[PDB]
Amino acid sequence: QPLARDAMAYVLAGGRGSRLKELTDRRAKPAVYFGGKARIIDFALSNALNSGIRRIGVATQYKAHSLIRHLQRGWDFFRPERNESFDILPASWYEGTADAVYQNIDIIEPYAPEYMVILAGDHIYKMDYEYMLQQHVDSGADVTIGCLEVPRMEATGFGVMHVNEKDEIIDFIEKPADPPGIPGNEGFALASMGIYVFHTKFLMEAVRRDAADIIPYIVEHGKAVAHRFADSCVRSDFEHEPYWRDVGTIDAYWQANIDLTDVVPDLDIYDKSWPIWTYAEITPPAKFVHDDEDRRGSAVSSVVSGDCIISGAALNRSLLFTGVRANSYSRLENAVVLPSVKIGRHAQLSNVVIDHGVVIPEGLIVGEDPELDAKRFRRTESGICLITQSMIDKL
Template sequence: IQQMVNFHISNLAKVTIAAIPVPINEARQFGVIQVDADNRVIGFQEKPEHPTPIPGRPDQAFASMGNYIFNGPFLTDILHTDAKNPESSHDFGKDILPSLYQDHPVFAYDFARNRVPEITEEEIGYWRDVGTIGSYWEANMDLRNIKPVFNLYNLKWPIKTSGFGLPPAKFVFNQDGRRGQAVNSLVSEGSIISGGIVQDSVVGRSVTVESGAAIINSILMDRVRIGPDCKINMAIIDKDVVVPAGTRMGYEPEEDKKRFHVDEESNIIVVHKGYKFPKSN
């Protein structure tokens, strides 16, 4: 991020927007930033039919990554001003940024030129739009690959986050039909795989997977508890959900649609935060 900060300072910018070059025929899916030859912002287009190309690069357009650097006092002033505007929806992309570029120095930072030690060519300019269930699932599934596009284990590109003080993940029991294991998966701190199997999945903090359960191609968020003998496939389960013993997801599509939200495009099952399963008779 220091490279973007340096760009912001050197241009005497009030605002700098992280931007990623995308093929012009794909730019219709994104918010497009229009810039001049110096990457100063001269306009915005929201999912345009005819995206404006980057100067000198007719086959590419700048997509907004939704990450910004502001001068602190300037940000405070514009937020106070926007809060008093009854016609504003108080959205950065829709209201605040479009109101600034004509009167203030607003720049786009080409994130594809950002360099981090020890990253691969594929990782340069890594960014994913996770605005759909399918794209969110795919971005997470990439992380558990043997050779992911984005490597979480590059210590030169650390992840800055709060410490949770949880113990390491634990895998217990080693009998036939009751073996705690994870394969091609990420399992976060505080989680216990207690006689179940996790395969090709991403598991959040303080998750429990009980004996006989099988989690495949799924995302389990923090504090999910999977009961014994559950079979979960192609699902995203949000925080604080207790899945009762023997529950099946991802194997009977018509039954899944009756009980859960199933994304129409990807067929991924989504269980919302804190969902309470009906009690069986």
């Protein structure tokens, strides 16, 4: 009996993405657009669905308006008569991650799932959660915790799990200077994905027995085991390794998107085997016009969504979301361009993330003058400008 039939996925989607700065000023991190493909939250949601988990809850917190609208419009196909449910819970004040689940016990117990699968909604990755449920029951564990096997140095910006010979967890440190290594495989550490499988009876206990803090109390006073991302990752034939991304900074967000322009991308957005569902509208095709001595609308080494009209504009190494209008004599290079952006004639922009809906003035130049760029816009140390409508308005 597939254990997924009896599980509920509970998605924590209050993450602010503080380090994305003005990208997350009027939206939560899980609402952030990714890949010309989806919003970040759709990865976790899609994994649950693809894994056979048909009961999903999503707890929101900060600036959730657009996230909730997205869920309402995109994730609307679950029917309770078929033992399917999708609950949007702005329960999660809020006060904590644990409280996000606690305060909606009265939504959970009616469904009576045998298993809870707690998921962070702010990471991009694909995983078949049935593996982790089978480990969780077979192992007799109180909690199974999803983990990345990363080099000890890279584990420094992570909650890290110190394990023993058979993967049982003996301690946990937040951001360790010298991350405890894996026994017999030192120089790799086991970092926390913030993915926790429980028995539901147990967790209601844990939540209503310590609610009115932290559940690594289980580590010390109980039985926590570790599940490795590599044991249940989903990989397409065109992905050379298990893909996971945090896109925690403007650099990392830019990079993950622009990497999709590669000839052989790390993430395969063309894969059908483990599909990412999202909110999408019927959209006309992308259009390229003008082929002149002075202007040519085309794209090279780029990803272009539908309803994009590239009119005498030159795009190189760029990713455009739906709705973009790029106008004559403009040029984009190394640009990640969110939906519905307009690029005026003669504008030239390089190494930018352009926010949703921004109208870029005729003639604007970005990525020529680093000093002017840092005055007008959010510039990273690496040279990426994040451009919003409010930065454009005060020029």
